[PDB]
């Protein structure tokens, strides 16, 4: 038993809610919150900008040190950093950004990172301003992640569309 509330069960291990991931994190304090990162960990907008703002820019400061030491992530890759005031850890996952011309085929690899964590609070990868088809991303999530994932979808109209179209 865990502390998430009001989530809709989709499969054996995936739950979904129309909510702000920052507020779900402030409430639950999950072991792992997933950020929809880019390879440079430059947290400008979307999930990343929102999470980073909620940490008072501490996420960005930590991320800049990570990049200075390790160099950029790979598209499809991830790193574990602090969750600051939002969670124990933040799993920064790079899904392909279609608006950058990146390969949507790498979405499955991005979701595979979730399998290294027993429970996660996460956004839908490559959705929103990342420019991919969100229905497709939800399909990839359910067909790839085997650990327990709680998805927080910000846009209400998107949430309603995803639920009503889910197979
Ligand atoms: O509309 C959606 O769910 C898709 C969208 N989500 C959010 O921007 C978002 N999700 C949950 N909590 C949030 N709090 C503040 C913003 C926010 C998104 C954007 C970029 C990358 C990505 O993978 C997903």
From Swiss-Prot:
Where found, per UniProt? Answer: Host endoplasmic reticulum membrane
Which residue ranges does the record assign to the Macro domain?
A: 1-167
- Extract the coiled-coil ranges from the record: none
Query: Origin, by domain of life?
Result: Viruses
Catalytic activity field: Thiol-dependent hydrolysis of ester, thioester, amide, peptide and isopeptide bonds formed by the C-terminal Gly of ubiquitin (a 76-residue protein attached to proteins as an intracellular targeting signal)
In what way does this protein cross or attach to the membrane?
A: Multi-pass membrane protein
Q: What's the reported outcome of changing residue 31 to A?
A: In strain: Mu/B.1.621
Q: How is its activity regulated?
A: Inhibited in vitro by GRL-0617.
- Its biological purpose: Responsible for the cleavages located at the N-terminus of the replicase polyprotein. Participates together with nsp4 in the assembly of virally-induced cytoplasmic double-membrane vesicles necessary for viral replication. Antagonizes innate immune induction of type I interferon by blocking the phosphorylation, dimerization and subsequent nuclear translocation of host IRF3. Also prevents host NF-kappa-B signaling. In addition, PL-PRO possesses a deubiquitinating/deISGylating activity and processes both 'Lys-48'- and 'Lys-63'-linked polyubiquitin chains from cellular substrates.
Describe its partners and assembly state: May form homohexamers. Interacts with N protein.
What is this protein's record name? Papain-like protease nsp3
């Amino acid at each position: 038993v865990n502390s998430f509330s009001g989530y809709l069960k989709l499969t054996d291990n995936v739950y979904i809610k129309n909510a702000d991931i920052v507020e779900e994190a402030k409430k639950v304090k999950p072991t792992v919150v997933v950020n929809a990162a880019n390879v440079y960990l430059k947290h400008g907008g979307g999930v990343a900008g929102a999470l980073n703002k909620a940490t008072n820019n501490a996420m960005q400061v930590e991320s800049d040190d990570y990049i200075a030491t390790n160099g950029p992530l790979k598209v499809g890759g991830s790193c574990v950093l602090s969750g600051h005031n939002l969670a124990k850890h933040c799993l920064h996952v790079v899904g392909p950004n279609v608006n950058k011309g990146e390969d949507i085929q790498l979405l499955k690899s991005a979701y595979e990172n979730f399998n290294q964590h027993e429970v996660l609070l996460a956004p839908l990868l490559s959705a929103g301003i990342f420019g991919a088809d969100p229905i497709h991303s939800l399909r990839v999530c359910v067909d790839t992640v085997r650990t327990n994932v709680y998805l927080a979808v910000f846009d209400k109209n998107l949430y309603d569309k995803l639920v009503s179209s889910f197979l």
